[PDB]
Amino acid sequence: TMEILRTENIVKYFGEFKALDGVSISVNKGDVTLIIGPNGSGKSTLINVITGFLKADEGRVYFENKDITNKEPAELYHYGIVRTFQTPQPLKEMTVLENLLIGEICPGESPLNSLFYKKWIPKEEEMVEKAFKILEFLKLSHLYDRKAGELSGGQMKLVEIGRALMTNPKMIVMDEPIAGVAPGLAHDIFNHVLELKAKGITFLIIEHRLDIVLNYIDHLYVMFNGQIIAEGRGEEEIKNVLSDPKVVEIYIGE
């Protein structure tokens, strides 16, 4: 079992505010890693540093040991690191298939980036074969021509994961993919995550808390004030963590 991603004492300031105070995490290939913590604890910031949206002021980030510290999304895409993005409104006017194909212009970048650089949605062989192979995986093949806006919220979320898959990634990073969903949808999204894990794909996900999808998590990290305050590897440890007095205290009123 090998480590696929590690961060070493990542520090990030926003003015005089230290958002990340020396965060060192480790993700192993295939692990569904979840980072939780109260709002403002620095989870999105950590992920933004790891995925090229923010530079680390101090610290190193390694993907397969290759120092990827501070590389933009366009470069990280070549390394096999992708991020899921929320679907912009205009993409909801495009078909499910177009939603998967538009990522070939600005690969690994925000959909707005791709949507604004698009002359005509690419329709090449290997591309369409990839898209349809992904639609089969998500069991959304018959929806290929349906406008993204007419999909259920949950089907739209699967399509967002589908876009990330277009880039044939090694690691998919998701910032709060199941925020606000009902238990059934949370299970649905996470069932597909498990299926993707079986194919060797690694997941680094952020969620506010952990409950419904508890048994889907291989590795857990709890953040607070830009620092890692707890960690669990495995069902029992993860359950210990969630019941940790100090962990529930940071959740008073949240």
Binding site for ligand MMC (CB under 6 A): 74, 105-106, 109, 117
Nearest to 141 by CA among 120, 162, 164: 162
Residues found near Mg ion in the complex (CB under 5 A): 44
- How buried is residue 42: exposed, middle or buried, by Cβ count under 10 Å (0-12/13-18/19+)? buried
Q: Give the interface segment with ligand ADP, choosing from 35-43, 86-94, 111-119, 245-253 (CB under 6 A).
A: 35-43
- Confirm if 39 and 254 have CB atoms less than 8 A apart: yes
- Single residue of 6, 21, 22, 44 touching ligand ADP by CB under 6 A: 44
We find the least distance from the C-beta atom of residue 81 to Mg ion, in angstroms, to be: 18
> Between residues 12 and 71, which has the closer beta carbon with respect to ligand ADP?
12
Distance from C-alpha of 79 to C-alpha of 194, rounded to nearest angstrom: 22
Please give the residue whose beta carbon sits closest to ligand ADP in the complex.
44
**83 near ligand ADP (CB under 6 A):** no
Task: Count the Cβ atoms, other than its own, within 10 Å of residue 138.
Answer: 19
**40 near ligand ADP (CB under 6 A):** yes
> Hey, what's the torsion of the CAs at 94, 117, 63, 210, to 10 degrees?
-40
Residue set of the binding site for ATP: 37-44
Residue 138 contact partner, candidates ligand ADP, ligand MMC, Mg ion, none, CB within 5 to 8 A by sort of partner = none
We find the least distance from the C-beta atom of residue 42 to Mg ion, in angstroms, to be: 8
**39 near ligand ADP (CB under 6 A):** yes
b/e string for 214-232 if b means 16 or more Cβ within 10 A? eebbbbbbbbbebebbbeb
Residue set of the binding site: 37-44
> Between residues 86 and 110, which has the closer beta carbon with respect to ligand MMC?
110
Distance from C-alpha of 161 to C-alpha of 100, rounded to nearest angstrom: 10
> Between residues 48 and 167, which has the closer beta carbon with respect to Mg ion?
48
> Between residues 14 and 116, which has the closer beta carbon with respect to ligand ADP?
14
Residues 5-34 that bind ligand ADP (CB under 6 A): 14, 19
Task: Count the Cβ atoms, other than its own, within 10 Å of residue 156.
Answer: 18
Nearest to 226 by CA among 65, 64, 9: 9
> Residue numbers of the site for ligand ADP (CB under 6 A)?
14, 19, 37, 39-45
